[PDB]
Amino acid sequence: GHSYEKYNNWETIEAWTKQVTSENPDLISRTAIGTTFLGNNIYLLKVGKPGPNKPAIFMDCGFHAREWISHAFCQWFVREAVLTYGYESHMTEFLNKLDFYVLPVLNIDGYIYTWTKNRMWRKTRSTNAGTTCIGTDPNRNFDAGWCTTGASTDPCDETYCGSAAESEKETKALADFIRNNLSSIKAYLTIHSYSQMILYPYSYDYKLPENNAELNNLAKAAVKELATLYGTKYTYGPGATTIYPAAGGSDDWAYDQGIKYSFTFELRDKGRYGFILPESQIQATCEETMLAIKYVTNYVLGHL
Ligand SMILES: CC(C)[C@H](NC(=O)[C@H](Cc1ccccc1)NC(=O)OCc1ccccc1)P(=O)(O)C[C@H](C(=O)O)c1cccc(NC(=N)N)c1
Numbered sequence: 209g210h211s212y213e214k215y216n217n218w219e220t221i222e223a224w225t226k227q228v229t230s231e232n233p234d235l236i237s238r239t240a241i242g243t244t245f246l247g248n249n250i251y252l253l254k255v256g257k258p259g260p261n262k263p264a265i266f267m268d269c270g271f272h273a274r275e276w277i278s279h280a281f282c283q284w285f286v287r288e289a290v291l292t293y294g295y296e297s298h299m300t301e302f303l304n305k306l307d308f309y310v311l312p313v314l315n316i317d318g319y320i321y322t323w324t325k326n327r328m329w330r331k332t333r334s335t336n337a338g339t340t341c342i343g344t345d346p347n348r349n350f351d352a353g354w355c356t357t358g359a360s361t362d363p364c365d366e367t368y369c370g371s372a373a374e375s376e377k378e379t380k381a382l383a384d385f386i387r388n389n390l391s392s393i394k395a396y397l398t399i400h401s402y403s404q405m406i407l408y409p410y411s412y413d414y415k416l417p418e419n420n421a422e423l424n425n426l427a428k429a430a431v432k433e434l435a436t437l438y439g440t441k442y443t444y445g446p447g448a449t450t451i452y453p454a455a456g457g458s459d460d461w462a463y464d465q466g467i468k469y470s471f472t473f474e475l476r477d478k479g480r481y482g483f484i485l486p487e488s489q490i491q492a493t494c495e496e497t498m499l500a501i502k503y504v505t506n507y508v509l510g511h512l
């Protein structure tokens with residue numbers, strides 16, 4: 209029951225990860241990097257033409273449960289990759305030279321909850337000692353100035369930073385995977401909505417990354433490219449000053465691991481629909497986003 213221009217439930221996305229892999233074994237392999245709190249499988253698709261010691265770009269979607277256009281984008285990206293390989297020169301070179309590690313849904317338990325109970329759920333669905341309140345904000349759960357700012361220590365809050373960095377099985381799983389593959393991973397891209405922004409470090413502090421000028425120029429070029437298609441306007445800059453300070457984010461953590469190209473994407477829109485982006489905008493949203501992602505990929509490849 210899968211469609212690329214509709215939002216798909218987890219059962220459908222899971223079946224899709226199996227199907228798309230089965231149908232494109234020369235471009236995709238599927239693994240599970242762990243289980244969620246509620247025992248769902250955290251799938252990771254390695255997209256690329258297999259070969260020895262290839263560099264890689266890591267991209268995840270679905271950190272936050274209600275940001276459905278994020279999940280949709282990872283699925284869209286994988287189809288574009290497999291459909292255009294061999295026909296579009298850039299994507300062909302991309303997949304020949306590197307792998308994309310695509311994690312289509314990180315926070316699966318929360319995503320399921322937005323389908324079954326509460327469309328505006330954000331956090332994970334793990335239990336918390338001493339309270340009935342459920343869930344941790346996965347993007348406050350990383351070891352990046354953990355919980356020192358822009359985060360709550362209260363499990364009942366939407367930005368609960370957890371009992372400790374990587375207290376969540378899902379964030380632990382992602383961090384473990386990236387740690388185990390640091391040599392290969394050259395960029396980290398994490399997909400969110402909404403706001404139409406590209407953000408780079410830092411968010412947990414007002415300090416700037418050493419390659420700040422490069423990141424600004426890269427984000428500037430990526431947003432220009434994105435705008436070429438439908439005129440969609442993005443802003444960009446360091447997380448802390450571009451949107452708000454917040455510790456424990458994965459982009460900041462990834463960067464401090466040594467991944468020099470680390471970006472948070474905030475997709476459409478600017479609040480007219482917010483998280484409830486109509487399915488009628490999935491195609492255009494994903495198409496323009498593809499251009500920005502491919503631009504960044506092309507740049508990273510030329511800087512290996
Ligand atoms: C709509 C976007 C902006 C999302 N924000 C929300 O859902 C926030 C979450 C929240 C809840 C209670 C108290 C504070 C914050 N809620 C909300 O209504 O946001 C509205 C809004 C809309 C536009 C601009 C600013 C805010 P996000 O995708 O969760 C933003 C994300 C994050 O908060 O994890 C983010 C943005 C930019 C950089 C980073 N990276 C980082 N390391 N912090 C992380």
Ligand SMILES: [Zn+2]
Nearest residue numbers: 272275400401
């Ligand atoms: Zn988000």
